[PDB]
Design a protein around this ligand. Structure first.
Ligand SMILES: Cc1cc2nc3c(=O)[nH]c(=O)nc-3n(C[C@H](O)[C@H](O)[C@H](O)COP(=O)(O)O)c2cc1C
Ligand SMILES: Cc1cc2nc3c(=O)[nH]c(=O)nc-3n(C[C@H](O)[C@H](O)[C@H](O)COP(=O)(O)O)c2cc1C
Ligand SMILES: Cc1cc2nc3c(=O)[nH]c(=O)nc-3n(C[C@H](O)[C@H](O)[C@H](O)COP(=O)(O)O)c2cc1C
Ligand SMILES: Cc1cc2nc3c(=O)[nH]c(=O)nc-3n(C[C@H](O)[C@H](O)[C@H](O)COP(=O)(O)O)c2cc1C
Ligand SMILES: O=C(O)[C@@H](O)c1ccccc1
Ligand SMILES: O=C(O)[C@@H](O)c1ccccc1
Ligand SMILES: O=C(O)[C@@H](O)c1ccccc1
Ligand SMILES: O=C(O)[C@@H](O)c1ccccc1
Ligand SMILES: O=C(O)[C@@H](O)c1ccccc1
Ligand SMILES: O=C(O)[C@@H](O)c1ccccc1
Ligand SMILES: O=C(O)[C@@H](O)c1ccccc1
Ligand SMILES: O=C(O)[C@@H](O)c1ccccc1
Lengths: 335, 335, 335, 335
């Protein structure tokens, strides 16, 4: 029985081959941004409210036209068969059962149509390809398969310098492939417009950190943004999303959904993100720890733990709803 | 002979079973708030005054209609028989003899009437129960037994997630019971009004951290508040009380007594709390360390040590009275 | 050959009995103020000037009517025979030869008249005694013996709680006595006036930390103040003098000399103190390390090292005089 | 194959004699400024831009009338034969091949004419000598040999106190000499004018930290400044250049080139410096690590690694040019 997300990391480190654990855990360069994602969350303290009605505490949100059970989605993580033989299908099944959206990756190790067939609330994460038509075809495939949002990753003109992967000489095992294919181009604002024109689905720009890029995303017709430094895996020295979140929320002024990711490791961290103004969070590495440790059941247990932690934190902070949690104030401390 | 409160923790760790020490020491979640209570106090430095008249230094205060020997009371700590066979009676006797108020708990392991019969200045801490009449009956019992204040704990709609207790599988020994009974409901502002209407005693709301909740407490007719994150045992990531204290003192503008707790471990810490504007502090864990180490005599020695440290700190800071200590300025440093 | 003051501490720790080293090294309480004296200096960075005339760099100052070779004096340290058999005579001789004022203590282990007979620039440090006439007699003795200033210590209404001394059961060896005698009273502003009326010498109030106490010192006719927390030995949690220095210098606006002490361990630290506005610094523990390590010759070597470090730091910062160093700007960093 | 600059330090420590490694690695005094150079860079986070055109990312700059391949030059480091038998010739050859300017030192262990004959973009670093005519002769020699800029080091009126060198008893081996000679005087603003009047080359003042000294440098006709604390080797406690850079860039308002050095250890650090407003950086110790580890080929590999890291960081931050990188915003964090 896992009582924190840290129990799952320990379990995953035991089972996974070192080089695969490093592919999962690592960041770019000196891992400054990877560490800062945690530092930033640890500096935030919540000012809870007391004596409020908690007779019907609900962790639900509405996002992109549908109810979610928590203010949380599974982040896009490439090549999930690296962590467990059932890969993306195990994670998607658990997410569906927990009422949490699951983000299907462009670089999924099971085809997007197979993962979408699991049901639930699939979103689709897009990388822009050298061959543009390939990009727009993926978008159409995702929409045809019932994906509900296009999460366009905008912080990967190319992959960052992952020194753990370089030192390990890491390569995909022959048994893991990019199953949507039978190569990156940098995305631009023109690419965003091409995607927006090609789909009725909300387009969510993932990897926004500058306030003016958040404003421009709204002007460009984005339905959402994810304020994110890609888990510290892209620019080493990029500011944590959590540090830009409040300023971004103020600047977009309700014009789109504002999600955040990077270092969410508890329901308390979800509360902090919400209190700083996030609509919802993405969670990456912990979901893969659970997958590695115990497959679908592991992911189920993680999501049940997170759900309990979110409920606990919200109620202790005097919040009967996620909207109330967004109205909490915070104070920076020292750790 | 103990020369600091840290001597008593070492003594208590030696004698207590690990799981009981963990029940006492622990906090919720990652223990971020537990640690921050100490961090916050360690960041505060006092700007002492020199050359003032110290011919009659007094540590006494008047609070809730009676003199106390120090600006301090024993915090409510449940189930004191866990720490020593005499439990609450040992602590109450020592508090009485030292001229310090003692807070009798709803979850006391000796009945509130027995503890009140010890004499001194008993206060009574209330938890709100699912069965409302049970709550109001406890209040009436406390008043009938001569308790002087009702300390309504407002930060426990339910118990926080104590991971040490979960990992240890901690449960009360068969020989420790909730002796006031032969179950929590969240308290609301309506509950506060019901208590206020049912007693002539001052009602003190314990667990206030938001400035507007402090204001509302005054408007609600509270005689006092305790600015507190419950010793880091409730919301993990809740701001330390000491960090909100100055802002709260300014906002209530003499409308009620403003106490603080969390991490007080010396007379110097009492001085810091006073300098930040507290009327008085509560002390929890150290009192239980002393109880565990040496029963009633241990608690007596702790309170004598604290009294000496408070006198020493006040005089070295140029303060002949607690009111003068409240007029001291402070400066944050780096530790 | 010693290349830093830290070489001398290592040497002193080797030779001294543990309890005597602890009497020297220790502070009050948790030693928070002792550590903060070092933290505060380490946070200060100097903004040096370049390309200035350094053809005649001088470290000299004028203070209390006489030239000193450095902006530095030996702090009052009680009972110097604890550290070396020649005690105060060894230190005073070395100070004289280096052109540095030496502060003779009320609790000197050699009589003030003997130490004054060494020559140089003796100052005299006063503690206020229960028997007032005793205090004023010491002042007259000091003046008759040729002391040039009365350093009235104002932060010792009684001795702080030195936990190292308590734990060691420290007491003076039978062979060390208070040689000025054959008992503390708290000093007040009235005591200061009594001293000022009884002497033509400048009165310097040592242990001022509050800005208004610095202002009042000027109004009271003080010739100087020492901004000081008594080396972290009095109020545990007292702000470092170095943190109050700039504000105090601005407030007194040339009305008296403003010295600082606490944690000066290099010529660079002297430069920092000067850049923050100090007229001069006092140095305590390092002088005793040198005395313990090698007697008079040890103190000589320390003062020669400090002189070289001060000259080096001043010139590298573009300062041909101490006045120029006072006009340097500083910037706080992170350590 | 080296994947970070830290790989090269490890390699250099293995090969070099301890005292030579210490001469290279060390700083003055307590090494506070040496450490702070790294601390300051680690506190800076970049706010990257997304979705910009990256079809022709270029790391080139124009400086002092010529193109450089990166916003970087090799810092002046004395006596390079200490690190490898080919010394300055190996480093200059690699710099030439990489399109990076190389700064020839007054204290080069190969003559400036020999190093200039390598080709590339040689600059010449000047120390002011007691014998003025010697100084101006070096300037004329440098100009006659085809050096493109005079880097006048202004922070060495004399050498700082290098405690590692003092403790090691470090001296030049008989086989390393100052090859430009067959003695320091402090430089002043008059010295700067004498140099400016004696050459048509841009004069660059290296070691400026005060904003008013930067302003005065522009007024004095400097073509550039290097904002620098001399790698923590001169005044111990001098502010890092990176901490003064933004304020200096604002004050000079395009009046000269503003370079920075101290602690640059990656392409990400180059990006940070650029984002804070630097025209270019100097890199010292890492170039010598590469020289020690593998001679000319080692330096080539270092410069290729740095070039890749700079390109990577710029593109990930949305910058197609160094000018765009200068328009990035930054945010301080906690490490
Ligand atoms: C192993 C791994 C693979 C990832 N793959 C992708 C990807 O293909 N597309 C993408 O947009 N983000 C990807 N991310 C970034 C995540 O979506 C997310 O931003 C990050 O994991 C959030 O931080 P967290 O892991 O600290 O929760 C990946 C992250 C990891 C750790
Ligand atoms: C073992 C334990 C039991 C506690 N029980 C109660 C309780 O029943 N009611 C309550 O209001 N607070 C309770 N508290 C919180 C304390 O009243 C107080 O807020 C906290 O101990 C203060 O922090 P300190 O222990 O650092 O002094 C408890 C604390 C501890 C450590
Ligand atoms: C062993 C010891 C004895 C001291 N005795 C006295 C004293 O008798 N009178 C006094 O005014 N200050 C006394 N001081 C305080 C010093 O004058 C001075 O404020 C302190 O040493 C400065 O800090 P530093 O030791 O870090 O340089 C003493 C300090 C020490 C360490
Ligand atoms: C071993 C060594 C020798 C140096 N010699 C000189 C010199 O002769 N002239 C000079 O202007 N700077 C000199 N410097 C300072 C460098 O030019 C530069 O300011 C510093 O190395 C930059 O910091 P970094 O080493 O952290 O990159 C030297 C630095 C080192 C480490
Ligand atoms: O961070 C990651 O690993 C992914 O975003 C990713 C990026 C580029 C190629 C493959 C996978
Ligand atoms: O500086 C601020 O207050 C924010 O940028 C911030 C910093 C660190 C964590 C969260 C939010
Ligand atoms: O913190 C504690 O242990 C008490 O406040 C407490 C809370 C809930 C149930 C029992 C005891
Ligand atoms: O930020 C502040 O100054 C206060 O909130 C505060 C912070 C830390 C300790 C005590 C008080
Ligand atoms: O700090 C010290 O030791 C002295 O100031 C001191 C104070 C009181 C009595 C003796 C000595
Ligand atoms: O806060 C400030 O700037 C000063 O009080 C100060 C703080 C720390 C060291 C020196 C000076
Ligand atoms: O830092 C260094 O070593 C050089 O700047 C230097 C300075 C003075 C003499 C020789 C070398
Ligand atoms: O205080 C500031 O913001 C700057 O001086 C600064 C500080 C630390 C690193 C870079 C820049």
């Amino acid at each position: 029985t896992y009582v924190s997300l840290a129990d799952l990391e320990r379990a995953a480190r035991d089972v996974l081959p070192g080089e695969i654990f490093d592919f999962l855990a690592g960041g770019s360069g000196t891992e400054a941004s990877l560490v800062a994602n945690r530092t930033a969350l640890e500096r935030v303290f919540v000012i809870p409210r007391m004596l409020r009605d908690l007779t019907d505490v609900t962790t639900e949100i509405d996002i992109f036209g549908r109810r979610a059970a928590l203010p949380m989605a599974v982040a896009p993580v490439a090549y999930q068969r690296l962590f467990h033989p059932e890969g993306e299908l195990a994670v998607a099944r658990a997410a569906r059962d927990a009422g949490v959206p699951y983000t299907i990756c462009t670089l999924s190790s099971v085809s997007l149509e197979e993962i979408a067939a699991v049901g639930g609330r699939p979103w689709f994460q897009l990388f822009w390809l050298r061959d543009e038509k390939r990009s727009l075809d993926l978008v159409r495939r995702a929409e045809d398969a019932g994906c509900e949002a296009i999460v366009f990753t905008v912080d990967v003109p190319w992959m960052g310098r992952r020194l753990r992967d370089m030192r390990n000489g890491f390569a995909l095992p022959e048994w893991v492939t990019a199953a949507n294919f039978d190569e990156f181009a940098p995305a631009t604002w023109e690419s965003v417009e091409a995607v927006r024109a090609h789909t009725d689905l909300p387009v969510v720009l993932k990897g926004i950190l500058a306030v003016e890029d958040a404003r421009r995303a709204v002007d460009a017709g984005a339905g959402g943004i994810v304020v994110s430094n890609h888990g510290g895996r892209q620019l080493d020295g990029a500011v944590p999303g959590i540090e830009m979140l409040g300023e971004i929320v103020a600047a977009v002024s309700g014009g789109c959904e504002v999600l955040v990711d990077g270092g969410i490791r508890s329901g308390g961290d979800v509360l902090k993100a919400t209190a700083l103004g996030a609509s919802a969070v993405l969670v990456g590495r912990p979901v893969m720890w659970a997958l590695a440790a115990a497959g679908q059941d592991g992911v189920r247990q993680l999501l049940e733990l997170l759900a309990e932690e979110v409920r606990d934190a919200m109620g202790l902070a005097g919040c009967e709803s996620v909207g109330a949690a967004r109205r909490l104030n915070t104070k920076l401390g020292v750790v």
